[PDB]
Amino acid sequence: ALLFTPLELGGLRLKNRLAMSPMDQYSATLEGEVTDWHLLHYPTRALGGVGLILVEATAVEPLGRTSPYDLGIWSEDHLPGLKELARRIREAGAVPGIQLHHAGRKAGTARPWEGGKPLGWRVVGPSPIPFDEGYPVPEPLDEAGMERILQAFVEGARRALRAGFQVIELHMAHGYLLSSFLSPLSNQRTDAYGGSLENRMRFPLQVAQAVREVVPRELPLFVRVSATDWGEGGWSLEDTLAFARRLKELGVDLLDCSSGGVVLRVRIPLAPGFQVPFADAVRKRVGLRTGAVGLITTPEQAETLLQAGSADLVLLGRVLLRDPYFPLRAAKALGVAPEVPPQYQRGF
Amino acid sequence: ALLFTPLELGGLRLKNRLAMSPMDQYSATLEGEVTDWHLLHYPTRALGGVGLILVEATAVEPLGRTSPYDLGIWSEDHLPGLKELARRIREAGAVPGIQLHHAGRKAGTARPWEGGKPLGWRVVGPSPIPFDEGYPVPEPLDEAGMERILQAFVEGARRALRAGFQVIELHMAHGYLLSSFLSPLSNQRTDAYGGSLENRMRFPLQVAQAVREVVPRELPLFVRVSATDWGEGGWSLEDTLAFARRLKELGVDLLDCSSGGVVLRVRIPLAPGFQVPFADAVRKRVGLRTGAVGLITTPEQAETLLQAGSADLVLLGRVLLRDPYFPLRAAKALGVAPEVPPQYQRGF
Ligand SMILES: Cc1cc2nc3c(=O)[nH]c(=O)nc-3n(C[C@H](O)[C@H](O)[C@H](O)COP(=O)(O)O)c2cc1C
């Protein structure tokens, strides 16, 4: 069973091919600090049996936050909390990783269970187009603003390494800053950073290159992309192949294949495995390693997409909110006798 | 669905009829203190959705421990750890309870994953019969020894209340001290505490009475019993009915119906729900409230035994070692929309 066979990335060996997908908990302090909520939530899933845990979207500067309760990494005073989080993930059995983030024109909304309405922050983006009705008009970035945010990504990554995280993922998806540079639905610039495909990829590729130079080759660097935006005349799978080629040449280890989130009024053909063909096409047509994600909920499903060569890694989100010990029971269901804490041996 | 209907016991209201059965983790310090292991293990299950958590067997004196890594409650310096444990169970959503324990002739063994062999402690019991080959011969208790242990139960209970626990269970089952007084297989005394049924019940009934006097009527008192020992000429279901009648008259709130553990060489007809008839017979023939336990693993199973009038409460052990969020998903499967932490709302 490939699902419970070790995976080599960079200098590491993950004990299996399951990972916890990044999932915002909206439970940090007002200064972006780790709380008791995170120190229970994450190590529960590490005991649950994933080889790799990708911690939720973490903001590289305060205006990069999705909400006033997002995690942050813009300050040296975030280091004690983040270091404690990574340490507890590791001791529960998993490799700790983290996603680095800037919300862009979608920054500064309320929590999902408090209505989720825009709070009127002075948000930034490529072009002055609001995300939707009620949303603030983003301020277009000049070249000095781009450089500032780029430096924040480079410093954010060094600080993640100092805290003990061994996988770094760049969030270039779901309509947030770098995703909004890629799609023509949000980017209508007429300078060097808009118009052509090459122009639209420019700022996202500069961020990737600069972070790669500060992360040693032993530790993997991931990128998450929306493979398509589902909108007519928007970002396509073919664009994703061109972008993946350029990431491969810069030394990116793996492309994490998601979709959607750029615009709001689009039809999405939701079904088990609906994003797997995007992971399959990059891996087979470019030769870059991939992560598959999107309504993956059973052991046999995840095993089969690996056997088909569609991805190297399987990412799980929602199933782990309602069933954190899924990977231990999945192993048993595929005829592998799982490694469990000795305290729970009579439970299996 | 009775399974997710509130239950009134004493002065409390449990939000549902599921409880976490007591399960030794062998992860305390050498002084019986709470550790990081317990502070992750227990609140995980409280978020998982049980109305009541019964913390593992906790030793009322050091010679009462099953292992050198059992929890203890013999000292005021156990209070800070126990208080922190109860507080974290409560804040994750469950009523915190605790089982009080004395291992008897089965005291002082190694952990299950370190071989489980006797360490040669100076153990006590009713009669000088070893549990099995290799085991130390217990020293028979005199009346002063009985009184000492009885006081330890009374003080143990006051200390549990000071820590914030709201349900107290007495462990009079599984071949440990008070269970071994009940069965003729371990008790062959010829004084006032052996021979007849009434004699064999005497020390166990004295413990129950004394603890009941220090626990206020608003807080429930439980007793766990082996309803049978499965051995020819041993403790029977009929004996259990007589014993339950006497517990009812003393003000005991509920009888927790288990079986076995007194002797080792007995045939046990293991199957889903094999201990439910014992809970059913006490509840219907005596009118004392009951807890059912033993290979209960599905929502429909637990609902049906409640509909039949076989018990008031359902206790879950092994299913919660491998699936701690079972009760949230069980609710959904019975058509009740569960109460979940807002962070996990999109998972359901
Ligand atoms: C509550 C919640 C929070 C999420 N937060 C993030 C995030 O911070 N960053 C990210 O890239 N994706 C995020 N996602 C998307 C998931 O990582 C995942 O890609 C998506 O839910 C599909 O996988 P699933 O069907 O296995 O959940 C989130 C999803 C949910 C439901």
Ligand SMILES: Cc1cc2nc3c(=O)[nH]c(=O)nc-3n(C[C@H](O)[C@H](O)[C@H](O)COP(=O)(O)O)c2cc1C
């Ligand atoms: C590892 C382990 C530890 C246990 N510890 C205790 C205990 O400390 N006290 C107790 O009364 N029962 C204990 N039990 C018995 C369980 O509480 C339960 O009655 C039994 O496992 C049957 O329920 P289940 O089939 O739902 O697990 C333990 C069982 C296991 C597997």
